[PDB]
Coordinates of C-alpha atoms in Angstrom, one line a residue:
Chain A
X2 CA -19.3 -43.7 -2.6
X3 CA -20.7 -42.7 1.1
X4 CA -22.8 -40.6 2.8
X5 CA -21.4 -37.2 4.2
Chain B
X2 CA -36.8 -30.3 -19.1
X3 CA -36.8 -26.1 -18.3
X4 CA -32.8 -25.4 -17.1
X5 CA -33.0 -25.1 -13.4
X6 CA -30.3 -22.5 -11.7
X7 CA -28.9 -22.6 -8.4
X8 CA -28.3 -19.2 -6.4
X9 CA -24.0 -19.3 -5.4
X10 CA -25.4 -17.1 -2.3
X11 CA -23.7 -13.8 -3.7
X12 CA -25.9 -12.0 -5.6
X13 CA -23.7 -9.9 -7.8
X14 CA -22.3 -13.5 -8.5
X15 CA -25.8 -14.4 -9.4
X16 CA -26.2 -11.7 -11.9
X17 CA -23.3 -12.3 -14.0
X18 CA -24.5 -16.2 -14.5
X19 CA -28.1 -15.4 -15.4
X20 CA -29.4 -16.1 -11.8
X21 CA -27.2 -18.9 -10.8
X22 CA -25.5 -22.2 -11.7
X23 CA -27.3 -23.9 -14.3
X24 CA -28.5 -27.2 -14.7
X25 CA -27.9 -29.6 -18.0
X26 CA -24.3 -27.7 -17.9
X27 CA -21.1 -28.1 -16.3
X28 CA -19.6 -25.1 -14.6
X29 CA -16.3 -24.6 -14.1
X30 CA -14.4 -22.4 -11.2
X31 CA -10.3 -21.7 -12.2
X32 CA -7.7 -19.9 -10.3
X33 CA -4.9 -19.9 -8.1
X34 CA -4.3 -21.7 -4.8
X35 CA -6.1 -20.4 -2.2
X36 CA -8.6 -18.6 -4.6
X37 CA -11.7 -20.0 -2.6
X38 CA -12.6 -22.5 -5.4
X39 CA -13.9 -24.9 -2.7
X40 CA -15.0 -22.8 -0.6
X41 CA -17.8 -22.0 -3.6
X42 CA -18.2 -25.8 -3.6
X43 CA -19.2 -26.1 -0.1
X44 CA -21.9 -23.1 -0.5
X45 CA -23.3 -24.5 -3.2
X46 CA -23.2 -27.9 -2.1
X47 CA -25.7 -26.3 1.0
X48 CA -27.9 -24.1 -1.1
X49 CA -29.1 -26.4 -4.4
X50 CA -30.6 -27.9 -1.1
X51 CA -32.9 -25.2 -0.7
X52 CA -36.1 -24.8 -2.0
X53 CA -36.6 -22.6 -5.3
X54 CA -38.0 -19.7 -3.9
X55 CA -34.7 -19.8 -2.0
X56 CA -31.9 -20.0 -4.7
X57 CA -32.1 -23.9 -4.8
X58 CA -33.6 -27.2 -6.1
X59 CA -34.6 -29.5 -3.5
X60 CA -31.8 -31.6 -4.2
X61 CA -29.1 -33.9 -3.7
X62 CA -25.4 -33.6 -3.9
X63 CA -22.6 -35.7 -5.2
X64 CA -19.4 -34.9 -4.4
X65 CA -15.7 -36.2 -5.9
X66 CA -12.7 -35.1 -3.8
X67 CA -9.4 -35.6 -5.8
X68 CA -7.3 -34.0 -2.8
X69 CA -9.2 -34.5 0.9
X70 CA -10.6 -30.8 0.9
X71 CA -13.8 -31.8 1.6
X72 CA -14.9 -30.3 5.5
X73 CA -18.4 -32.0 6.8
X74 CA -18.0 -29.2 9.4
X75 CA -17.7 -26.7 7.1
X76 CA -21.2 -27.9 5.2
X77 CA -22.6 -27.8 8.8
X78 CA -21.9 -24.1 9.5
X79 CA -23.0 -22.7 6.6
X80 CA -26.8 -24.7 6.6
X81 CA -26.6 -23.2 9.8
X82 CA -26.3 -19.8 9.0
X83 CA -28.7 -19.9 6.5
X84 CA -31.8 -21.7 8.7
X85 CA -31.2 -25.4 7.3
X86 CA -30.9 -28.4 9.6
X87 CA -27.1 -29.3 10.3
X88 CA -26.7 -32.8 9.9
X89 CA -29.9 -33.1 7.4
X90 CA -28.2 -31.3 5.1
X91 CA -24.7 -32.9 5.4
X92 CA -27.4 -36.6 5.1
X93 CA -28.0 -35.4 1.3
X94 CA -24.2 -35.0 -0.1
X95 CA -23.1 -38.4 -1.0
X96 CA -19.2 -38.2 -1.1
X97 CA -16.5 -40.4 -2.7
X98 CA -12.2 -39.8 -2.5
X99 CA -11.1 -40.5 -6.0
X100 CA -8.2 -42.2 -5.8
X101 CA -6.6 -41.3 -9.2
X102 CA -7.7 -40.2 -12.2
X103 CA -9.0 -43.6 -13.4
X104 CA -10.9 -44.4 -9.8
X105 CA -12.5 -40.8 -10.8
X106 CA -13.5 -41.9 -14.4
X107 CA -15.0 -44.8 -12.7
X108 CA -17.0 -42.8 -9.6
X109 CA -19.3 -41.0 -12.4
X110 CA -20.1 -43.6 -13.6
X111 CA -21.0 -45.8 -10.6
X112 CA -22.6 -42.4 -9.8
X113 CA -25.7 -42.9 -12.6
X114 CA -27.2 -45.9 -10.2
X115 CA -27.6 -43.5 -6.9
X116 CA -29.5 -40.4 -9.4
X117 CA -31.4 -43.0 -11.3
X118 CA -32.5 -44.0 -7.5
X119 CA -33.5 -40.8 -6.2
X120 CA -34.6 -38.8 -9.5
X121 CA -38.4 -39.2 -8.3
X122 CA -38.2 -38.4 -4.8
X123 CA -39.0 -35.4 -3.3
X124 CA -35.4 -34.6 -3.3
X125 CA -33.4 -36.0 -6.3
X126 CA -29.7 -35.5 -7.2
X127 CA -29.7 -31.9 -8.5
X128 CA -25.5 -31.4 -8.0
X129 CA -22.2 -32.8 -8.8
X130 CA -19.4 -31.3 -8.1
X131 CA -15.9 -32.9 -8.9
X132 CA -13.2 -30.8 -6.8
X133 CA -10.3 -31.2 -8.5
X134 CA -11.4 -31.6 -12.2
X135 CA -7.6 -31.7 -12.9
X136 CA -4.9 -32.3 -10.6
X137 CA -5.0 -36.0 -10.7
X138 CA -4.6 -35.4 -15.2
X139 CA -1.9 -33.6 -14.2
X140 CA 0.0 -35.6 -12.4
X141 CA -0.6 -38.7 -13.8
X142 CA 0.0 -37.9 -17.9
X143 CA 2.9 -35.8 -18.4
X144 CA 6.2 -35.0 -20.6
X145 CA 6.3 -35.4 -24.0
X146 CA 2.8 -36.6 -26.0
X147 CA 1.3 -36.3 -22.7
X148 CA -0.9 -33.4 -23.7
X149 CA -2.7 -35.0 -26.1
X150 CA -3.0 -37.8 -24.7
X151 CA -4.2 -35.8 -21.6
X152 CA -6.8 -34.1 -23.3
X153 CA -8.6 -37.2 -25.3
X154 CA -9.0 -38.7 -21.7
X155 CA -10.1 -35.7 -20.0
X156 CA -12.6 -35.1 -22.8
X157 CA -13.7 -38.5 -22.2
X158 CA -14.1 -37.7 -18.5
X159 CA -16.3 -34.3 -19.6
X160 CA -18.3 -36.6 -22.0
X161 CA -19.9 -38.3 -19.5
X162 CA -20.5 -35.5 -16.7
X163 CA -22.3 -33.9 -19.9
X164 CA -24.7 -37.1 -20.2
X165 CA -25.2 -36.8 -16.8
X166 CA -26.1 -33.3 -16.7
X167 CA -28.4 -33.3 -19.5
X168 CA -30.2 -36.6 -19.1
X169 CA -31.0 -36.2 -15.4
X170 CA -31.3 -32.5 -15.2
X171 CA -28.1 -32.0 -13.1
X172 CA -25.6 -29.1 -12.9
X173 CA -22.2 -29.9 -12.5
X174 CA -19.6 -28.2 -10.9
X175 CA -16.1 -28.3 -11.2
X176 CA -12.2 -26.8 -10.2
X177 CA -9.3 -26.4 -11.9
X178 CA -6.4 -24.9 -10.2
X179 CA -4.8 -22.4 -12.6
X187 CA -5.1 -25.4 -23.1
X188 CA -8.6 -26.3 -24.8
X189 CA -11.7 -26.4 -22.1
X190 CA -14.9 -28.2 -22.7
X191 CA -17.0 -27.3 -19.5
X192 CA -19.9 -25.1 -20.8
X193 CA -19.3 -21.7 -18.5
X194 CA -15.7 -21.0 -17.2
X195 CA -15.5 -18.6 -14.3
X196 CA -11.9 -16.7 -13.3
X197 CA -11.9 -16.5 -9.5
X198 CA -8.9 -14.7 -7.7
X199 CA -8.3 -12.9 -4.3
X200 CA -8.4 -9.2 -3.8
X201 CA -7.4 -6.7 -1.3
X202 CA -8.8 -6.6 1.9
X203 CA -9.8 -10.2 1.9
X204 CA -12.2 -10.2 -1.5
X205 CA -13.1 -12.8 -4.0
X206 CA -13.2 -11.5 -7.8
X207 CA -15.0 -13.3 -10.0
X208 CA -15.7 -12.9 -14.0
X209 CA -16.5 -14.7 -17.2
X210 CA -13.9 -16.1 -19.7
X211 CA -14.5 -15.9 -23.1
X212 CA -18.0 -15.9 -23.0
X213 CA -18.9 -12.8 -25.5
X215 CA -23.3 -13.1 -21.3
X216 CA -22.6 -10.3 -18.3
X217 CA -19.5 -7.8 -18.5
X218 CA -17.9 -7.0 -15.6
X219 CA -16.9 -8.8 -11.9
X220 CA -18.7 -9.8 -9.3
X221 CA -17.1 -8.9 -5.8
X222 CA -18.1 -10.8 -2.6
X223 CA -16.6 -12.3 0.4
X224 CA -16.0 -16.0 2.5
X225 CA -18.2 -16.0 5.3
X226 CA -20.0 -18.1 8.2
X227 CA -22.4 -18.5 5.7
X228 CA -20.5 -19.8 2.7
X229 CA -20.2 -16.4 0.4
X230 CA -22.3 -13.3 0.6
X231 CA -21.6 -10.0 -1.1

């Protein structure tokens, strides 16, 4: 998971 | 907790789902290649960010790519075109490339520590989509006693995007490029002539009839  | 709906940004869309995508269910787009299944994604993904009076829910996004579709620019033109900050809205979509079907088993449920984290602030997760549902199942468990097999695990997979859903109040939304089905709403997407998008409800004895509408700078709009 990451941000955008 | 009252359902929540988020607006699609085509109203004749709108209409046929009772007023948009809901929450504490898991939607599910199917259709051919080139359908515009994620392009629905990506308009979504902008307006659940919006606030109700809009169409949306002041919330968050999670998003599972299965096959590198996924376009930041793409989220950026359509908040864009529809008064929302750029790069404030592409800041609220966490994203995540599942790497095969067990690395996507795994991302939901990593996925419960991030909503737990935001579920009271101002803007907690209120969307996961999972674009493709299927293609990694499909590749991976295949020829003979695959299908059951196939199905038990992709029921397991559904399982847990239902707990999600319904104990944080989420909707989920999901593609499947086109058996028994277990999302709660499945919607038939195809092209049309002169560059249209026709979309209707499969066996779901509420709304008769197709909703017509076309890709645009700001996602979909009929």
């Amino acid at each position: 998971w990451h941000t955008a | 907790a009252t359902i929540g709906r988020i607006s699609t940004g085509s109203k004749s869309l709108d209409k046929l789902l009772g007023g948009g995508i809901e929450t504490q269910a898991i939607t599910e787009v199917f259709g051919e290649f080139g359908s515009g299944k994620t392009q629905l994604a990506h308009t979504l993904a902008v307006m659940v960010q919006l606030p109700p009076e809009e169409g949306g829910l002041n919330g968050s996004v999670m998003w599972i790519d299965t096959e590198n579709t996924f376009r930041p620019e793409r989220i950026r033109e359509i908040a864009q075109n529809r008064g929302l900050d750029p790069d404030e809205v592409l800041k609220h979509i966490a994203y995540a490339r599942a790497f095969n079907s067990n690395h996507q088993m795994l991302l939901v449920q990593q996925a419960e520590d991030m909503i737990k984290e935001l579920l009271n602030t101002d803007r907690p997760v209120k969307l996961l989509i999972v674009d493709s549902l299927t293609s990694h199942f499909r590749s991976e468990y295949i020829g003979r006693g695959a299908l059951a097999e196939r199905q038990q695990k992709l029921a397991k997979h559904l399982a847990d995007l239902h707990r999600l859903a319904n104990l944080y109040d989420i909707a989920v939304f999901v593609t499947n490029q086109v058996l028994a089905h277990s999302a709660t709403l499945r919607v038939y997407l195809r092209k049309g002539k002169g560059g249209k998008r026709i979309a209707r409800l499969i066996d779901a004895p509420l709304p008769e009839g197709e909703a017509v509408f076309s890709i645009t700078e700001k996602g979909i709009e009929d």
